[PDB]
Design a protein around this nucleic acid. Structure first.
Length: 268
DNA sequence: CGTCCACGTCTAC
DNA sequence: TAGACCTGGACGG
């Protein structure tokens, strides 16, 4: 449920649904506090795109589909466990909170948003969350500008490790990517953000892009990968997050920051 | 049995 | 700046 996983999940929706046609209603599990998706069409296609830590699905009726229905966009945040699966209609995983059903010619499948802790959220309406900065994978240049044009923001008074989670400037970076980013440059996690950034080979804002981009290139499921294949690849990619020999500390919100060496000046 | 820990926001005091 | 929101795996007694 960081930027690489959101991005992988959107490619997964795009490839796995390339040749599917969905039909009928969009079904929500009983226990989910998210809104119902008012949307029905007898033949519709599903596509996605990611931005940062959000993913957007577009439901698009084929020509002639019934009820009349305009394209609908839904935006998902994954929380600590969100994911998508394509499964056989009658073999729904345990926590499938939102389900999309294929239509006949072929075997009956269900595309499901699966989310065990239910920190995930979706919204009707298709807009990115106001306030999230640009995507570090897909909008690098905008991402880099939005940080540099704004170093006066009180966000940058904080440790660089806490600033890297702030989605207003680092949309996409989560807890493993911060430790990996910081570790490639050996920046103490508790340096003040503004000092590391004012200054303006790869620097820290470049690593915010190419680091998550390396996870995307492993393919697979990234953090969400243990039967493995996917999983062994990811765990082999990590140099820092949770590794033996590393230090860790809690930041001011209780999140664990892995690192090596100097904790840096603002440490608890 | 029990405690801790996990890829993140949110709202409310 | 504390909590709340949740399930389940690892591991302890």
């Amino acid at each position: 449920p960081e930027g690489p996983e959101l991005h992988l999940a959107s490619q997964f929706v795009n490839e796995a649904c390339r040749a599917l046609v969905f039909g009928g209603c969009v079904e929500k599990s009983s226990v989910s506090r998210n809104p119902e998706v008012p949307f029905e069409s007898s033949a519709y296609r599903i596509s996605a795109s990611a931005r940062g830590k959000e993913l957007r699905l577009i439901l698009s009726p084929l020509p002639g589909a019934q009820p009349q229905q305009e394209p609908l966009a839904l935006v998902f945040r994954f929380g600590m466990s969100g994911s998508f699966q394509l499964v056989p209609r009658e073999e729904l995983p345990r926590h499938a909170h939102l389900r999309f059903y294929t239509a006949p010619p072929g075997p009956r499948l269900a595309l499901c948003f699966v989310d065990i802790r239910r920190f995930g959220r979706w919204d009707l309406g298709g807009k990115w969350q106001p306030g999230r900065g640009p995507c570090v994978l897909q909008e690098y240049q905008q991402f880099r500008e939005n940080v540099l044009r704004n170093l006066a923001d009180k966000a940058f008074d904080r440790p660089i490790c806490e600033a890297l989670l702030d989605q207003r400037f680092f949309n996409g970076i989560g807890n493993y990517l911060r430790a990996e980013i910081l570790y490639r440059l050996k920046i103490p996690p508790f340096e003040k953000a503004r000092s590391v950034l004012e200054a303006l080979n790869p620097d820290l804002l470049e690593l915010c892009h190419s680091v998550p981009k390396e996870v995307v290139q492993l393919g697979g499921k990234g953090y969400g990968s243990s039967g493995e294949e996917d999983f062994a690849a990811f765990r082999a990619w990590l140099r820092c997050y949770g590794m033996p020999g590393m230090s860790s500390l809690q930041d001011r919100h209780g999140r664990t920051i892995w690192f090596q060496g100097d904790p840096g000046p603002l440490a608890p």
